[PDB]
Amino acid sequence: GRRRSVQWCAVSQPEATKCFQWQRNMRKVRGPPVSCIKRDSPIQCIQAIAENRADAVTLDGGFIYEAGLAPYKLRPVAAEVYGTERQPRTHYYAVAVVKKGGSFQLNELQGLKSCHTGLRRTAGWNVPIGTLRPFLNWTGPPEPIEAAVARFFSASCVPGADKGQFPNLCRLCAGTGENKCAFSSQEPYFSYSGAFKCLRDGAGDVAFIRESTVFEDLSDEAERDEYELLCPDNTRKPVDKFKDCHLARVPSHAVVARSVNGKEDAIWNLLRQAQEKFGKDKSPKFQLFGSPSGQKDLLFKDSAIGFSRVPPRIDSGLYLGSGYFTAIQNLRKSEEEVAARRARVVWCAVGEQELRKCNQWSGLSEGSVTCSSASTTEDCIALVLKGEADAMSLDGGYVYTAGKCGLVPVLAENYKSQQSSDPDPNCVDRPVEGYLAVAVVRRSDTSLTWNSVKGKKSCHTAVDRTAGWNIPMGLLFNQTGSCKFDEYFSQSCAPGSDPRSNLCALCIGDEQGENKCVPNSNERYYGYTGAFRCLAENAGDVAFVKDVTVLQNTDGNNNEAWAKDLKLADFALLCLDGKRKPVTEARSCHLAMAPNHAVVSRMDKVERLKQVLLHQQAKFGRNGSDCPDKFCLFQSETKNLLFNDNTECLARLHGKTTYEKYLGPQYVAGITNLKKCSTSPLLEACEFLRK
Ligand SMILES: [Cl-]
Ligand SMILES: [Cl-]
- Resolution of this model in Å is 2.0
Q: Cβ neighbours of residue 646 under 8 Å, at least 6 residues apart?
A: 415, 416, 548, 552
Is the Cβ–Cβ distance between 235 and 119 less than 8 Å? Answer: no
Angle separating helix axes 681-690 and 316-330, nearest 10 degrees? 60
- Å from CA of 210 to ligand 1 middle: 7
Q: Which ligand sits closest to the CA of 436?
A: 2
* CA nearest neighbour of 389 among 634, 602, 232: 602
CA distance 361 to 371: 9
The residue type of 186 is Q
CA distance 180 to 194: 13
Q: Which ligand sits closest to the CA of 495?
A: 2
Is the Cβ–Cβ distance between 494 and 469 less than 8 Å? Answer: yes
Is the Cβ–Cβ distance between 690 and 404 less than 8 Å? Answer: yes
Integer-rounded Cα Rg, in Å, for the chain is 28
Q: 3-class SS at 351?
A: coil
Is the Cβ–Cβ distance between 469 and 397 less than 8 Å? Answer: yes
595: DSSP letter = P
With 0-12 CB in 10 A as exposed, 13-18 as middle and 19+ as buried, what is 152? buried
Q: Which ligand sits closest to the CA of 208?
A: 1
CA distance 216 to 466: 43
Q: Which ligand sits closest to the CA of 527?
A: 2
Domain covering 1-91+251-339 in this structure, CATH number: 3.40.190.10
* CA nearest neighbour of 324 among 126, 146, 105, 107: 126
The phi, psi pair for 269, rounded to 5°, reads: -50, -50
b/e for 230-245, b at 16 or more Cβ within 10 A? bbbbeebbebebbeeb
- Å from CA of 315 to ligand 2 middle: 29
Q: Cβ neighbours of residue 212 under 8 Å, at least 6 residues apart?
A: 92
The secondary element (H helix, E strand) that includes residue 14 is helix 13-28
Cα angle for residues 323, 141, 337 (degrees, 5° grid): 55
CATH T-level topology, domain 92-250: D-Maltodextrin-Binding Protein; domain 2 (3.40.190)
The catalytic residues are 73, 259
- Å from CA of 685 to ligand 2 middle: 23
Q: Cβ neighbours of residue 630 under 8 Å, at least 6 residues apart?
A: 364, 620
Residue numbers belonging to the annotated binding site for hydrogencarbonate: 117, 121, 123-124, 461, 465, 467-468
Cα angle for residues 561, 564, 566 (degrees, 5° grid): 120
CA distance 100 to 260: 50
Q: Which ligand sits closest to the CA of 159?
A: 1
- Å from CA of 612 to ligand 2 middle: 27
Sheet containing 598-601: give its strands across: 392-394, 598-601, 408-415, 647-651
CA distance 572 to 532: 12
CA distance 38 to 48: 10
**Residue 126 CB neighbours (<10 A):** 22
Residue numbers belonging to the annotated binding site: 60, 92, 117, 121, 123-124, 192, 253, 395, 435, 461, 465, 467-468, 528, 597
- Å from CA of 558 to ligand 1 middle: 59
- Å from CA of 691 to ligand 2 middle: 30
Left, alpha or beta for 406 (phi > 0: left; psi -120 to 50: alpha)?
A: left
CA distance 596 to 435: 7
Domain 435-594 class in CATH: alpha beta
Angle separating helix axes 352-364 and 606-620, nearest 10 degrees? 80
Is the Cβ–Cβ distance between 75 and 316 less than 8 Å? Answer: yes
**Residue 489 CB neighbours (<10 A):** 26
CA distance 169 to 116: 9
* Domain 340-434+595-691 listed as CATH 1.10.1270.20: no
- Å from CA of 377 to ligand 2 middle: 13
- Å from CA of 381 to ligand 1 middle: 29
CA distance 595 to 395: 8
**Residue 386 CB neighbours (<10 A):** 17
- Å from CA of 34 to ligand 1 middle: 33
CA distance 157 to 165: 14
1-91+251-339 and 340-434+595-691 share one CATH topology? Answer: yes
Q: Which ligand sits closest to the CA of 125?
A: 1
Q: Which residues pair with 207 in a beta bridge?
A: 97, 115
Q: Cβ neighbours of residue 514 under 8 Å, at least 6 residues apart?
A: 522
- Å from CA of 65 to ligand 1 middle: 17
Distances (CA, A) of 178 to 21, 29, 157: 44, 54, 14
* CA nearest neighbour of 104 among 204, 240, 234: 234
CA distance 669 to 657: 18
Is the Cβ–Cβ distance between 547 and 471 less than 8 Å? Answer: no
- Å from CA of 461 to ligand 2 middle: 5
Angle separating helix axes 264-278 and 13-28, nearest 10 degrees? 80
With 0-12 CB in 10 A as exposed, 13-18 as middle and 19+ as buried, what is 638? middle
* CA nearest neighbour of 598 among 645, 681, 663: 663
Q: 3-class SS at 510?
A: coil
- Å from CA of 198 to ligand 2 middle: 53
For the chain, which residues make up each domain, given as ranges? 1-91+251-339, 92-250, 340-434+595-691, 435-594
CA distance 287 to 310: 23
- Å from CA of 96 to ligand 1 middle: 12
Q: Which ligand sits closest to the CA of 209?
A: 1
Distances (CA, A) of 137 to 152, 325, 649: 8, 21, 38
CA distance 222 to 613: 43
Q: Cβ neighbours of residue 386 under 8 Å, at least 6 residues apart?
A: 317, 318, 322, 325
Cα angle for residues 237, 238, 242 (degrees, 5° grid): 80
Residue numbers belonging to the annotated binding site for Fe(3+): 60, 92, 192, 253, 395, 435, 528, 597
The residue type of 215 is F
CA distance between the termini of the chain? 37
Residues with C-beta atoms within 5 A of ion ligand 1:
117, 121-124
Percentages of the chain per state (helix, strand, coil), in multiples of 5:
40, 20, 45
73: DSSP letter = -
- Å from CA of 523 to ligand 2 middle: 15
Residue count of the chain, please give it.
Answer: 691
Sign of the dihedral defined by the CA atoms of residues 683, 686, 688, 691, in that order: negative
Helix (H), strand (E), coil (C) string for 234-245: CCEEEHHHCCCC
* CA nearest neighbour of 358 among 170, 521, 509: 521
* CA nearest neighbour of 540 among 590, 604, 472, 592: 472
CA diameter of the chain: 93
